[PDB]
Write a protein that binds this ligand. Sequence first.
Ligand SMILES: O=C1c2ccccc2C(=O)c2c1cc(S(=O)(=O)O)c(O)c2O
Ligand SMILES: O=C1c2ccccc2C(=O)c2c1cc(S(=O)(=O)O)c(O)c2O
Ligand SMILES: O=C1c2ccccc2C(=O)c2c1cc(S(=O)(=O)O)c(O)c2O
Ligand SMILES: O=P(O)(O)OC[C@H]1O[C@](O)(COP(=O)(O)O)[C@@H](O)[C@@H]1O
Ligand SMILES: O=P(O)(O)OC[C@H]1O[C@](O)(COP(=O)(O)O)[C@@H](O)[C@@H]1O
Ligand SMILES: O=P(O)(O)OC[C@H]1O[C@](O)(COP(=O)(O)O)[C@@H](O)[C@@H]1O
Ligand SMILES: O=P(O)(O)OC[C@H]1O[C@](O)(COP(=O)(O)O)[C@@H](O)[C@@H]1O
Ligand SMILES: O=C([O-])C(=O)[O-]
Ligand SMILES: O=C([O-])C(=O)[O-]
Ligand SMILES: O=C([O-])C(=O)[O-]
Ligand SMILES: O=C([O-])C(=O)[O-]
Ligand SMILES: [K+]
Ligand SMILES: [K+]
Ligand SMILES: [K+]
Ligand SMILES: [K+]
Ligand SMILES: [Mg+2]
Ligand SMILES: [Mg+2]
Ligand SMILES: [Mg+2]
Ligand SMILES: [Mg+2]
Lengths: 420, 436, 425, 424
Amino acid sequence: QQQQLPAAMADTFLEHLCLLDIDSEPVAARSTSIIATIGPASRSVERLKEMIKAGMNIARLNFSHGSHEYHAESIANVREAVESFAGSPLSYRPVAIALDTKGPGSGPGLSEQDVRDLRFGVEHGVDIVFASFVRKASDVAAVRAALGPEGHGIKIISKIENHEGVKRFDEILEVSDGIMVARGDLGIEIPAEKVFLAQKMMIGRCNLAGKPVVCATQMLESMITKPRPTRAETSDVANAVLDGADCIMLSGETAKGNFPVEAVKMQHAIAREAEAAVYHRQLFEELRRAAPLSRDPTEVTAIGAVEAAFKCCAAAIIVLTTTGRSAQLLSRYRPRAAVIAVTRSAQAARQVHLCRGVFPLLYREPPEAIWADDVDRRVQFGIESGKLRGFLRVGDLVIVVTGWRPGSGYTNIMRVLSIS
Amino acid sequence: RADVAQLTQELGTAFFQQQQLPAAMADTFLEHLCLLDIDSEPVAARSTSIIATIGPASRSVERLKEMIKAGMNIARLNFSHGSHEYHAESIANVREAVESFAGSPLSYRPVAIALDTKGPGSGPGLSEQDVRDLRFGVEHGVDIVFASFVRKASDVAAVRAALGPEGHGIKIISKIENHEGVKRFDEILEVSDGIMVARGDLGIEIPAEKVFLAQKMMIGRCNLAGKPVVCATQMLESMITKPRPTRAETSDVANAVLDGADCIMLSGETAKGNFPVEAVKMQHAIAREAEAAVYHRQLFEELRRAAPLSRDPTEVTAIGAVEAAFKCCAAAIIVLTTTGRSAQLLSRYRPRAAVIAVTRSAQAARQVHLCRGVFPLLYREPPEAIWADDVDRRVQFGIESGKLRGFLRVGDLVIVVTGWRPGSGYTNIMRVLSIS
Amino acid sequence: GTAFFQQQQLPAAMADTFLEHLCLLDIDSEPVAARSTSIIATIGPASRSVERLKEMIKAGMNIARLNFSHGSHEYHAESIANVREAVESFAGSPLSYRPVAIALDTKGPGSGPGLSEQDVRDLRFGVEHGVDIVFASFVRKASDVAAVRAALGPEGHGIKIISKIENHEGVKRFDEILEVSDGIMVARGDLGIEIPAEKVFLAQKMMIGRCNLAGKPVVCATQMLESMITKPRPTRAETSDVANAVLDGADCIMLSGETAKGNFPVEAVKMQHAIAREAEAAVYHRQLFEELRRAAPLSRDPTEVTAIGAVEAAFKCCAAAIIVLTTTGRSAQLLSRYRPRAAVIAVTRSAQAARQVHLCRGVFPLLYREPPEAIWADDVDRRVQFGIESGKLRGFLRVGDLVIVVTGWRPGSGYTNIMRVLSIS
Amino acid sequence: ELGTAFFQQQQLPAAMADTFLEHLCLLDIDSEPVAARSTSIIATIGPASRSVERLKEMIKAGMNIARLNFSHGSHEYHAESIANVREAVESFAGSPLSYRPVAIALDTKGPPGLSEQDVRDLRFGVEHGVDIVFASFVRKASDVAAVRAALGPEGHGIKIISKIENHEGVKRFDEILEVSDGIMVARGDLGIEIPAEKVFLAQKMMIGRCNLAGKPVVCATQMLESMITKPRPTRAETSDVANAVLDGADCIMLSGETAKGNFPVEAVKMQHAIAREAEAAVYHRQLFEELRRAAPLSRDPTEVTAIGAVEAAFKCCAAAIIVLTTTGRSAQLLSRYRPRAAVIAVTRSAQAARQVHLCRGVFPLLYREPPEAIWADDVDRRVQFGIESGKLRGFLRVGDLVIVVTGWRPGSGYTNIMRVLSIS
Ligand SMILES: O=C1c2ccccc2C(=O)c2c1cc(S(=O)(=O)O)c(O)c2O
Ligand SMILES: O=C1c2ccccc2C(=O)c2c1cc(S(=O)(=O)O)c(O)c2O
Ligand SMILES: O=C1c2ccccc2C(=O)c2c1cc(S(=O)(=O)O)c(O)c2O
Ligand SMILES: O=P(O)(O)OC[C@H]1O[C@](O)(COP(=O)(O)O)[C@@H](O)[C@@H]1O
Ligand SMILES: O=P(O)(O)OC[C@H]1O[C@](O)(COP(=O)(O)O)[C@@H](O)[C@@H]1O
Ligand SMILES: O=P(O)(O)OC[C@H]1O[C@](O)(COP(=O)(O)O)[C@@H](O)[C@@H]1O
Ligand SMILES: O=P(O)(O)OC[C@H]1O[C@](O)(COP(=O)(O)O)[C@@H](O)[C@@H]1O
Ligand SMILES: O=C([O-])C(=O)[O-]
Ligand SMILES: O=C([O-])C(=O)[O-]
Ligand SMILES: O=C([O-])C(=O)[O-]
Ligand SMILES: O=C([O-])C(=O)[O-]
Ligand SMILES: [K+]
Ligand SMILES: [K+]
Ligand SMILES: [K+]
Ligand SMILES: [K+]
Ligand SMILES: [Mg+2]
Ligand SMILES: [Mg+2]
Ligand SMILES: [Mg+2]
Ligand SMILES: [Mg+2]
């Protein structure tokens, strides 16, 4: 059988590895998001359409290079390429826009250039900020203050790039929306042979906290000049997914290299293979054991839904979400079932790419008069887009996660539904 | 510590010191035993049902009201003794005692009536007296049959045929009392509604020192199958003449509950002894202590690992509801059921939360006592015009009756299990509700 | 062979979960291993005759308990003499000889707050008569154990003190009592009067678990086969209670009125023997060994390090036995704490140690009486060969079996450090 | 006692964790490695690494096995490389603290079956006393039998490590592993023969199966590729080396990095540094439990002694397991249980001393003293040699506990004793 199911049913991790089969083809949709840096090699609308088709989920703009005018044109081109697929509403793909700051460049403070760039991000409607060189909780507070009242909804992903950031990780993670393991600077700031320890520790802690973690830098470096990566590069991408990374990133590979589309395609192919090789039997038991007891109905519904999905091998968990939170709480238990998140918020649809296994569907259908009927069409929309995209078939079982009243914060219902 | 820290701040340290919760949170079975505390008081309602044999010592309506208050859930009538006239009078007295509390859902306690057959004797199958007694049971509306000396699947088919078309709803609990019944256990369990480990005859039919192996094997297999299992005979034997049991007797009751028995039984202790009410009270006290001492962490993990994957929505909803109940330390799981099946599927995962089963069927309310942790509520209100409103009213009836009986408190989290359409077989919804 | 893997609940032993282990238990899977839980039989009018004591030793009695709550010093001295006479009547066959420990159970503190003056006199009687163990009644705190130890004096340094936990205070102060005691007795008679009867099983399971964790002997006592005082067969609750005490992890099981004053002393011993053998094969060693290993702290004591290596090696090859040379019994006790399925055959020259190792589950003491060889390595080998010959004669071993041999690098107690895999020829 | 500082080093807080997730969360960049590097480094000796002076630097950097790629050069070229390796190794024979045996491995050019050139190159290997053969493109058990037969009458002791480089080799892995001494995951050809994105699955599967079988597994090709031209590797390269060790590889290899690159010594130093870090990060608690649960019961005293010795080593945090071995088999059976303690293998065989580099955590000590007339005295002398080398090299201190594994009689195949010794 397909998707490494013989290896998935093994009684030990050792037997799981022994049962991995190169002929067991992946069937599930790719769960780990790809962040591609948009630069000289990947700026055109035509090239961006090819990168979206190849698998890009988040477009990163490196504010260490270019200018505000340059990045504004890149943002416009990304939006134009994304909207060129709006003619097919059940299959259109949202793409988040992330702003990566230049950093403090000396001074444990928020550069005035960073204040100006963060203000640019708010004015241009960016979804995420990758905050460079975060070394303490007060650095995150400074970024949040610089985003102002209009940028309240922007996610702050703190980049850990030095010894201080690693040592003060817990306080940084507590106030951040997520973390980026920025291996480039980290490998210069700490001994290169210790970076893998920092990566594995940060991924584990983010998985424990249920917060997004991005693995970044030199993942497919040789692809800047060559059409195929080295054996160490494919292994690095696969191991980042197996470590538990929610996102994988391409920097020079897409910003300035000769094969930007090929680099995205390679990350897509490796992530799909690595996701099927995840040993869910141990992973779910450990996530379940480590996750604290909770009296929050969204949290309680999420664990019940993921348990139910594993019991019936559910093809998907369809969840209605306003902010993306209910989808994030499902994602933290790493279900094998795809989490199809139906949302009316375009920003939440883009941001939800930070959470592994969450497939955002932006709902743009006319409302139903009775709230209960409106909820049911959003569920049938998740099922129709699910069927159109290959996630679901007639006869499949799905878990549907909804709330008892409109507005964010009221998820409390899990339903077992048979498709068609 | 960090996996229970926010909930310890919210519910308090006193909450986590009661009902053997420190022992329940242990990482190993050895650590679990080391953390058992005689000062950790049981809080939950007793979930293992007590079957009491009704005979000369426990027959009067006044005495039966005392036994219902002490905790009796199932009244057993041993057709190896008395007559049809004697047993019919016992049944009438049980029903009169049960109906004396029928004025309210707060006081009403359904009590199942079980008929224990005389058995095949030296014969190879269903005896003529058993056919007559089984017909008597159908005519008197008994809920359960404890079929004596079941040795093969064809013995339970013979009992089913002798109950006729009008006894289709009666549960057949096969009594395993000899070597053949133990060896053919799987085929017997497949066609039975449940099993009774009849240790009296078993201890004579096989070496006495092997009975505990048969008991533990049968309890384990019934737990795996999700079918009721009764532990029976000599549990509190000395209480036939003495007001207090021996140390081996209290240990035996506790170990039957820890083994996974859904029901515990009293035979001579209630049928002919000097302290029938005290024997019920003692079983009640021991079962509540033993239930809190169950190592749910390993038990739930093992029930999850052993149970095969399922495409039955009732089964899928039941495991999701039990997982949700454990996550928030839910006080109860309120389930709507017509036949008791949805409550049985919740019960097989052994939640620590009480399963409050709301049903319109009086027979299902009596029979669910066979499933550990199921508290039946008989709903007697007439149906609402809108089906969704009728469902909501039954859920609210469960909550109100739960609150008025101490099962629920304001601020508690309750898991509610319902279906998407009327009729049996459509349970598929789990809701997390905060009690206000 | 397939027959080997069908006996001693081996299908249930190989199960991946405790639930599947229970589902696989088979009443037709016969026990093969020797009974490892010791039987303490209380001595009284029904079991004092030398001829009756010979029958009780053959039935399986390992420890003779003298209850100082009854009788005079002259009575108990006569009990001791009869036990020793019955035990020594089998000394003519050194390969089959079974040592029997003598335990003195004290009267207790009564209304007083500590060690009574009668207990001081009885403890000194025990030292003078060479008793092996003291079952100290109503131990409520660590200072009660220190008072017993002081009353035994310098000549009773080798006597084991097993503290009886019989009330709420003893249960609450269990950790401090276990720390200074050699072991514990769950005295359920008094405990069931001192605390609610329905809570005794929790105290029993907690104390057995903690003793197992500490590697110290634990005795389950009182009313185990009570009905056998007057009836020839026990109730279903009684056989279940004995089996569950062994499954809980008790090192010893006890008979009080059943052997002291009942009509069936020999049969009560035989019944406990039969149940214990069945219950020992039903122990789920896969989880048990894993949990004992995980819970046991790291150690820099060579005897402790050799013991875990020897138990792990025994499980790897399904060793029939672990033969250990011991002066004080300590090396055998450290093997016993890991609950090997292999019998621990303890070869010793110390008659007191041979009697005392009965407190440890799975330890079969062999008293070696030959005078020391001039060459120490040859003396060690002769003792190992004596263990093998006794093992073969008693049915523990056969030619072709693998055995683990545990010895030390120099004479005297405290130097066990060697483990060897040996093929029986 | 050991002190709080002891329990903060070598990822001991992460090692004591109750779950793999907690283990990852407890990894600390400030927890320094203390144990000697246990994963062997195979360095390909070519134009960039051939001189005696350069070879001395590579031995000091950590090279344990010298690989000679018979796809390049000639017999005369490789014979000179072998001579230079032996000369560099013997330049440290005067000092017991620096003397390290180095195995010599011959990597064949490759094939329908065994090629004519491979028969001649295998014959060259036997004549030159090579220790290991890395057999290229092994696709079935009969390929291993052909190599074994070509190793003439004088070369049956040479270890055959089968290189799995294509779909057929992956599919017929079990039959190949059964007749091979070990496996090499030859990722270069494998990444061309099968889709590049599936190579990590083949690597993890082969490493797992070799670990289960107790046979050496080598991770090879492009581990530090960028170091062919640059002095420092990429983030993917350090991650790849660490993950190969964490996967369970016994050996890690350098090809172009040492054969033709600008930084051969630096590439060896980098693999040394990463492997030491990755070895301390191994989650032994789950690993040992799983190796124990998966390994079948055994009536072989060497195998029974080995598991008892590894269990005893974990119980006391033993600094080393000193084992007397003539063929290296007793050290290999200790190595399969992945002890945290170094396995110091004391042997009179120079060949076995070179070959045990294939087994993770085995530190060979060649013993050349003349035999004692009393066998028990000869064993004691060898045990003390391992303790004294261990004190000299920093493995041991007075007061440490060591596990000693010996047999009851001379000759190979009788290991059955495990002793706990206090270092005095
Ligand atoms: O965005 C840019 C860019 C924008 C405008 C002019 C030039 C560049 C450029 O040269 C560049 C960029 C990004 C990266 S990065 O994302 O890979 O870090 C680079 O390495 C890099 O060199
Ligand atoms: O039901 C009866 C009964 C009915 C009518 C007259 C007399 C008896 C009677 O004497 C009796 C009964 C049950 C048991 S039971 O506990 O074994 O089931 C007895 O042991 C027992 O003695
Ligand atoms: O040029 C050589 C060479 C030349 C002369 C003697 C020996 C080698 C040699 O050993 C080598 C070489 C090239 C490669 S490559 O071209 O395949 O990358 C190797 O891998 C490799 O090992
Ligand atoms: O995941 P979030 O942000 O909490 O949103 C979940 C919310 O979505 C719903 O399912 C539907 O709400 P809306 O009708 O407002 O879209 C709510 O019942 C629930 O509270
Ligand atoms: O447990 P059972 O016997 O399957 O009954 C559960 C049934 O009860 C309900 O919750 C309510 O059904 P009714 O309205 O027929 O009483 C159904 O939706 C569900 O199928
Ligand atoms: O278990 P103990 O009391 O520590 O005794 C074990 C001792 O027995 C021996 O194996 C043999 O000692 P003896 O020759 O003194 O009997 C010692 O090497 C070892 O120290
Ligand atoms: O690992 P190998 O090849 O089996 O060698 C182990 C052998 O070494 C010894 O420990 C010592 O043997 P020698 O004295 O012959 O070297 C033997 O007793 C044992 O059989
Ligand atoms: O900024 C980054 O992404 C880095 O340093 O790796
Ligand atoms: O029939 C019974 O109930 C018995 O034998 O125990
Ligand atoms: O003293 C005892 O043995 C008791 O109270 O059980
Ligand atoms: O031969 C090799 O080592 C390869 O192909 O990677
Ligand atoms: K930047
Ligand atoms: K009957
Ligand atoms: K006494
Ligand atoms: K080659
Ligand atoms: Mg940076
Ligand atoms: Mg009967
Ligand atoms: Mg007493
Ligand atoms: Mg190749």
